[PDB]
Amino acid sequence: NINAFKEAVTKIDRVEINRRLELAYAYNASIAGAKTNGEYPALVVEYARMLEVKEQIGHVIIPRINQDIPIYAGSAEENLQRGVGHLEGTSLPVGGESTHAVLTAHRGLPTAKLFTNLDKVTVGDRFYIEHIGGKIAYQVDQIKVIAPDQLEDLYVIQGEDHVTLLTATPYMINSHRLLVRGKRIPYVEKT
């Protein structure tokens, strides 16, 4: 899992990593640029191929709830079973001006806690993402509960850099979605 990712990435030269991020940066700019054109966001395929190392696109760490979990491309059930699903149609989770990454998961599973305690994360709490290019930090600036049908909160916000953690709610009813939103912040690597 994560281990096979950290070690795998460490074996890839700078130039290749660079090339792969640049693909993802361009992909994120396309998504943000369609949004500015008043275009609608559409929320076996390799849209995030460039970011995959051992089938994963990164992992999400959340110290408040002791979770460190691998991110898979796409919101497909078989992925949602082993970790986080990245929502196709939303920014790839490498940061940048005008990016909004969205990651989903099951809020409770006999095999993995996953986002079962996401309701404990509070504004001001931090979460991190490790990807091929390294590690970036977010601080929670918004917590919201929407209907499954309400999509506006998941679109790119021009000028901003965000990632939304999403899961079903209330616990055991799962009739609405809970969104825990982070704002990009600086991250002091040697710490």
Numbering used by the authors: 5 to 47, 60 to 207
Verbatim from the authors:
Anchoring of these surface proteins to the cell wall peptidoglycan requires transpeptidase enzymes called sortases, a product of an srt (surface protein sorting) gene. The membrane-associated sortase recognizes the LPXTG motif of the substrate protein, cleaves between the Thr and Gly, and forms an acyl-enzyme intermediate. According to the current model of sortase-mediated pilus assembly, the pilus polymerization catalyzed by a pilus-specific sortase is followed by cell wall anchoring of pilus polymers by the housekeeping sortase. To understand the molecular basis of pilin sorting and pilus anchoring within a bacterial strain, we investigated the housekeeping sortase, GBSSrtA, and a pilus-specific sortase, GBSSrtC1, from the PI-1 pathogenicity island of S. agalactiae SAG 2603 V/R. Either GBSSrtC1 or GBSSrtC2 of this GBS strain is capable of polymerizing GBS80, the pilus shaft of the GBS PI-1 pili.
Therefore, we generated a Cys184Ala mutant of GBSSrtC1, containing the lid mutation (KDPYS to IPNTG), and used this mutant for crystallization. The association of the two GBSSrtC1-lidM monomers observed in the triclinic unit cell, related by a non-crystallographic 2-fold axis, is identical to that observed for the type II and III GBSSrtC1 dimer association. The two monomers of GBSSrtC1-lidM, with an rmsd of 0.63 Å over 164 atoms, display differences around the active site region. Molecule A showed a continuous electron density for the hinge region between H2 and the lid, and this formed an extra helical turn. The lid in both chains was visible up to Leu47, which points inwards into the hydrophobic pocket, positioned precisely as in GBSSrtC1 structures. The low B factors for Leu47 in GBSSrtC1-lidM and its surrounding hydrophobic environment may suggest that the spatial disposition of Leu47 acts as an anchor to the lid. Because the DP(W/F/Y) motif was dislodged by mutation, the entire elongated groove was potentially available for binding; however, the active site is empty around the catalytic residues.
